[PDB]
Each structure stands twice: as structure tokens, then as C-alpha cells.
Amino acid sequence: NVNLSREKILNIFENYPIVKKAYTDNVPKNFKEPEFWARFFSSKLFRKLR
Amino acid sequence: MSHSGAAIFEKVSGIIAINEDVSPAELTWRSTDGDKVHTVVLSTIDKLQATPASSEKMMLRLIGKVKPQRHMFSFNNRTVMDNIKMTLQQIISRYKDADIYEEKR
């Protein structure tokens, strides 16, 4: 389990604009915030950005 | 290869495919001769029952939410078992998290 606060996820938002672009076209159209973050944290993009 | 496999559904052979790009996610079982197509929408899935590798006959049970809905997928190879169960476990974990957090919100 990991803890994700609003200031934390906003910090992902400015330091990685690619995650912001992933948010914008996905969370009001296809699927929601917690499953989106689960997909991103299971994706290779999280490893490559880390 | 990870999202496709061969399985037996209701003692009838067919192909299991994972439609993950569509929202909500689906498991489609297609009859090979074109007799029937069964679909599972993954939002209304509660729990998964599996069997250990020491067991001979391989069953995969899907239990949904409301009398609960029960689905049976008989499998053939342990790699198909492994990749199907890990993809299914990840997506039902995501859907359970989404349902829990929407209930909390």
C-alpha cells in the first residue's frame, strides 16, 4: 500500500507533465482516478520516470 | 500472447481473449467453430477462485455481485493459467479499489 495526498499527486503533475497529459484525456472520459493510478504505477512509464 | 489463450467453457473448447483497452474491461470467450460468443464484463466481478498447480484438473471460477453469478473456465496449460490469473487479479484489484473508493466518496 502507498499513500497519495493531493499535494503529492500535484507534485507528480508539475514535475511530470506527461502524467498530466495522461490524466486530462483519461479521467473524465474512460476510467477513474484510483484505477488510473494503479495502471500507471503498474506501467513501465512509472519505472522509466523513477 | 499474454492476452490470448485456449480454454474450455461449459465442456466446450474455445478461445479466451482479454479486451483491456475498452472501458469496462472484458473477457471474451469465442467458440472456435463460431457457435457462440460468451462475454464477461469485469466491473460486476466480486472474486476469483483458482486451483493450485499440484491439482490435476484446472478450473477458474468467477463470482460476481447481485444470487451471485458464477462462471467456469476450464484451462489447459499452467502458463495460460498464470498470465490469465495475474491479469484478472490486477484488474479485479483495480475495480475493487474503484468500488471501495467510490463508496467512501
Place this chain on the structure above:
Amino acid sequence: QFLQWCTLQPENCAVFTSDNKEMFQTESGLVVSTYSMVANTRNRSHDSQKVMDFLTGREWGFIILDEVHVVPAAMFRRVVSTIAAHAKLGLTATLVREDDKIGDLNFLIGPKLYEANWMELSQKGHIANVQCAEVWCPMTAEFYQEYLRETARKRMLLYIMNPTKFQACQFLIQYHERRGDKIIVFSDNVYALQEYALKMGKPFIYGSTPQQERMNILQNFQYNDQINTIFLSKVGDTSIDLPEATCLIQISSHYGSRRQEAQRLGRILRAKRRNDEGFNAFFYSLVSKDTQEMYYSTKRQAFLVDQGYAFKVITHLHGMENIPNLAYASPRERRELLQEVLLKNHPLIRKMY
């Protein structure tokens, strides 16, 4: 420990026990055996006699006498003669005996090379910081009258089996189980061990218990969170493997055995939680008041106060009346317990045979 900490090969290491009797084939190496096997003056087996011939015929460079306090015994003494070793190191924690033969180790092994300062090790955190306490249990009138009108062997069991020590031990078990402590309750009397264990619902280990049951109970004590208390007889004093324990309750003892007292303290001196700030292990010696157990307890603690430990006397446990299930609180059950304690003491001809 040899094979783990040092670069000694298993082909260079050998074991002389009952099951294992094969020796190392190299020109030098390690053999580990027991005092009884080495000093067995009984008619030993042929292969063990061959191993003893090998040990005697070799000139050994170093001998490690673990628990050297048993070396001054009757024929454990001769293991330093039958084995011609150039260097002799006796390693111990309890360098006391209840006879005056402990000073013979200066002639057997050698002078007292090193003594550890136990308080310095405790404040450096190498061993656990133990709170030693002596809990005074006032006997009931009936048990004290029966204690006065009996001989010493019945007197021992009768001051061990008093209901006040039942109540104090049960209260301490409940309190330290709420505090989340692994508790060992030591009692040499086997009948008292069994009665306390059946009264308190905690497992007991003594001499006649099977080895598989002992291992299962010890594993449950180490890992199961519902098993936080084990009752141990004198099997726990000798060098057997025990799980990590932080609380110890001594119900009975073997007279004034300072060696057994410090051996019991050593079973909680090595607790894993030493790195935690504010952690303290607990030693309790539950003794019946106005008996010879007080005399024997002071005699046992005389060695531990030489190491620097202070035994705080506890004449009152706060909460002894608020405990819901108190053992032997009713006078009729006390009388029943008194009654149990008092009533404790040519091939064809072979078919015929």
C-alpha cells in the same frame, strides 16, 4: 556455529555423539562431543571405544569446555586428564556450585581469565536490561498449618502449591500477555508445573514430554501470537534451544541453586528487543512468605546481586482484586486444592516362551 562463523570445512569437522561416531580423516580438525560420552566409565560400545582411542592417542591443541561449572563433578573432572590438550578454555555464564569444589577449576582448567561486567553489558545493550523482582506470596492459614505439621519433602510441595502464588502468577501472566511479552514460567516440581499449566491453560514442557511435542510447543511459542506463555521444568535450565522470551516467572526452584537462578536469568538476558529504547525484560521469583523458600531464594539471589542486579521486593500487585477469573479465590476450592496436595503423597521348545 563453527560452520557458520569460521572457514572450517565439514570434512574437517567431526561429531562424537550417540548417532554420529565417524571421525575426520584429515590430519587435524574439530571434534565436538559431550562430557558424559567422554567420561562414560560404563561399558561403552566398540566403535565409541575406537573413537575414544583416537581422541586419547591424538595430542590435541585446544579444548573448549562449554559450561565449565559442571567440570568439577565426580568424573566430569577426568575429561581434562583423559584428553591431553595444550590449551584449555572453559566458557561459562554461571561460575558457581553449591559445594566448595568450584575452586578446583584453577587446577583443572586454569585461572579465572575474564569476567564480564553484566551491568556494563546491559547498559551497552549487548544483553537485555532485566528488572529482577521477588514476589512475596502470603500463605493461607490452612496451608501454613499443614506446612508446619509435615516433613521437608511435603513442605516443599506445600509451599509451592499455595493458592496465593497461583493468583500472583495468573495476574502476572495476564498483565504481561496484555503487554505483549513472551513468558517462561520455570518450576522444577513436575506436579506443580502440570497443575499450574492446567489451571492457567498454557502449555508445559518437562522431561517425559516427547521431543516432537516439545518442538511443536516451542515453535508455537515463537510464532503463534495466541501462545505467549510456556511452562518449563528443569529441562529449560540446561542448554537447549529456546525461543525469545522477555518475561520470566519462577514458581519453584531446586533449593539454593545459584547456577540455576542465573541460568534462568540468561534465558531472558538475550532478548531481541534490546535495540528498542525503553525496553526492559522482567524476572519474577514468586516465593511463599515465612517458609524455607525465602531462605533458598535469598541464597539463589546472592550470586545475582554479585553481578550487580537488585531484586525489588514486591509485597503487593495492584489489580489483584480487579482480575475477573482468579484461581482458587473461594475457600471451598482452596480446601479442595489442599486435599489434592495432601493426597499427592532345540528349536521346538521355544514355543512355550
Place this chain on the structure above:
Amino acid sequence: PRKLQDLGLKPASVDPATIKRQRKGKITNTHMTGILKDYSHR
């Protein structure tokens, strides 16, 4: 798979399997039969 390298070619196959391949004792603690648990692993 072991003669292609004798003939000089690279063998894409490994050599097959033909060539070179291989209680319950008494319980004294009768008052907690079922409270203690078995531990076959650490």
C-alpha cells in the same frame, strides 16, 4: 544436436534426454488439542 558441431555447423538444438540425464507421537498437553498450531516453516 551433438553431431552438427562435428560436421562444423552450429546446432540450434540442445542434446535430448536420451544422451545424459538423471511420525505422530503421544501428546502430553491434552488440554489444548486444537489450540496449538503446526509450524513446518519459519
Place this chain on the structure above:
Amino acid sequence: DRPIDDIVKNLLKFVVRGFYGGSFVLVLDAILFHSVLAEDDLKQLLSINKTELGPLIARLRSDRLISIHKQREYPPNSKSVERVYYYVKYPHAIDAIKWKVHQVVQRLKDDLDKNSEPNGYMCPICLTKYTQLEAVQLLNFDRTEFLCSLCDEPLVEDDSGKKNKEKQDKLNRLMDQIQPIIDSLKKIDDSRIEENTFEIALARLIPPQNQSHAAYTYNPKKGSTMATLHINITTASDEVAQRELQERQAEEKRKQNAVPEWHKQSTIGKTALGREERENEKTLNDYYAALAKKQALEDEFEDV
């Protein structure tokens, strides 16, 4: 899928289309499409009689383009038979292709070399050959004609050497036709192939028919010696509550490590142990509106 699997699939397809007939092409293409395939599966797809697939399967096994598995299962109707599974072993198959085409080139060289020694002679009456080395033991007294040892007939000329250019042309026509084979062999020898078996080949199966009596589940035998990610999104207001909960857990740790009373303080003097905001926010809203106007079957279970 995997590029080397594509190359070996095209190599097997090319060799079965070149050196084998159309029914062989159909059977091996079915094997390459559906990874494992039982006899009833071949019958259902190809409508081929058992006696018709006989020579087909026999040739494919004798060239090891396909291999057989003799596994029998236990169907629910208990009418079990020792059915046979047909699949492809890629490394043994490609090694067989290399060995076959290599030694075919080798004895084509042998045949053209045997043509390249001079022709010799043969006797038409007795239909026996006699090379130039032993014809000179059979020449006549007139020193003009070679006479046969049995027929006593003048030896006639053979044609081992007149056809050397024809054999060279046939070799060339073989080589330019089998150029794709050698290119595929070069690629699969440059790259690395996985040694597949029946158990590996079950992983990428596309099933052939619905009411299949063949069950693809493997049955191991004894004695034959032949994770998840969970997150916690919060609105940064319950994070204070979570810090409070961790602080809480710190004071239960403090009572875990707390010193008891009978150890902290002396027990001698004690007895012996024995038996309104809504409406003013409405006024703020009204004042803000006024200001804005102013600007305006049960089995084993596992938890997975």
C-alpha cells in the same frame, strides 16, 4: 509474434510446399496454425480419411516435420482412448532440414564426381558395365575392340561425362531454387531458438473445434524414468487524521513498553496480595450578492 518463430514457420512452409504434396502442405500448415492438434482435430478441419492421412503422417514423422505425443486423458463419459497429439518440434525440425539439404548437396556432388570420371563401357547383351581400367584386360588380339568376358561382344560407349554439364545445370537449378531455405537457415543460425516441446507448445494454442474429445490439459506422472498494488488517494484533510492514527499507535507502543507500577514504586505500604454559523454564512452570501449587484460442483478454492 516472435520474429524467429515467423522465420521458422516460413521455412517449414517453404520446405513442405517444395518437397511435399498439397495434403502435406495442408497438414503442416494446420500444425503451424494450431500449435497442437489431435487426430480428430485434423479430421474435423481437413475432412481427410484415416487411411489418407496415413502416408501423410508417416512421411512427416519420418522427416520429423511433426512429432507425436501418446497422452490419454479421462473424459467425463469414461470412454477414454489413447489418443495421439500432433505438434511441431522447431529445433529438431530445422536441424532435420539442415541435415537433409546438406547431405543432399553432398551426394549430388558425389554423383557429379562419379560422372566426372571417364565413362567406360557397357555390354548391351549382358547389361553389365566395364570401366576403362578393366576393358583393357578385355581388348581383343586385333587390338581394336573390347570384347565382353561372357558375351564376347564388342563393348559400346557409355555416357558418363557427356552429361556432366547437365548435372552441373541441375545442381545450379537446385541451388537457386533452395536459396530461400539457406537464407532462413542463416537467419535462424544467427539468432537463438527456444527448444519447444508439447508442454511448451500448449501455451500458444488456438483451439480447433468445440466438441473436442481431446483434452489439452497435461497429466504429470511419477515413476517414469525413461504482488498486487494498492493506493490511498486522500483529500489532504484525512492525512491529519492518519498522522493522528500513527501518533495513536505510538502511544499504544508506549503502553506496550510501559514500566509496571510494582516495579516503578515500592509496594511495602500497600496491603498484602491475596483473594449561528449557517445563518451568518447566509448573511455573508447575501452581502456578496449585494456587492455583485453593486458591480452589476465444488472443488479447491484459492484467494487470488
